[PDB]
Point group: none
Chain length 155, copies 2
């Protein structure tokens, strides 16, 4: 805003008639813009008019802040709910991961005992078969019964 100082320098400038027509025209513009945008607004401005204006800015700012707050809050919640989900999911998977983890070797080293049981027996059979063939020339009908059991098949 043109301080009373600066305005008066312009009015003494324009006083002199032999001032250039580029500086006279420039100096009255200065006074045109200056009056244009603010002087003119203070032609009406009542202490009440601009109290309401100031108050309305205030309302508008809080309304704007509040809407922003609303938005941010909804976003944070949604990120939070995804983390909760994933966590109900981390819980559950590492549960079954462990529930599978040795049910697997409950059943597995169950097995490697049922293996050497199989091998225990298989070896009894291999030795019986041996004996059988040491005495195969005898045509022993009982031995033949036994031999026929050994090589009998439905594995």
């Amino acid at each position: 805003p043109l301080k009373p100082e600066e305005h008066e320098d312009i009015l003494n400038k324009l006083l002199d008639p032999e001032l250039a027509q580029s500086e006279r025209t420039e100096a009255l513009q200065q006074l045109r813009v200056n009056y244009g945008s603010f002087v003119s607004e203070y032609n009406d401005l009542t202490k009440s008019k601009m109290r309401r204006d100031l108050e309305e800015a205030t309302l508008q700012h809080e309304a704007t802040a509040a809407a922003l707050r609303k938005k941010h809050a909804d976003s944070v919640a949604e990120l939070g709910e995804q983390i909760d989900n994933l966590q109900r999911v981390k819980q559950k998977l590492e549960k079954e991961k462990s529930e599978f983890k040795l049910e697997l070797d409950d059943v597995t080293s169950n097995m490697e005992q049922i293996e050497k049981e199989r091998d225990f027996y298989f070896g009894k059979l291999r030795n019986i078969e041996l004996i059988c063939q040491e005495n195969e020339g005898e045509n022993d009908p009982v031995l033949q019964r036994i031999v026929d059991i050994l090589y009998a098949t439905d594995e």
Copy 2:
């Protein structure tokens, strides 16, 4: 004072330099008291504090929205990183769960066979057992060897 354009009709009186300088000095004498009145009204304590008040209100509001936006873009980043981690851990547990699962599917089926083989063999042994009890009325030394094998530890 001067309507927005009893002002403007005088910025053009002054424009023509051939105005007499006894009514160039009047048209400026009026512009000068106008401004006198204007500045003392612009300078009014209530109106000036209201001017400052409004200015400072917009500033603080801008400062505050900025702080709120930042607090928000930091949160979302931090929550972002937690969410991605929980997904890469999710995928890791998914792999681990099913690989344990697929191994017990292969190893479960793998021993219902081995069992079948065991029972097959035990059956044979039981068969051979029954024959040895039929013929221990004669007592072959060969049979005794077979019996000895049946009951070994």
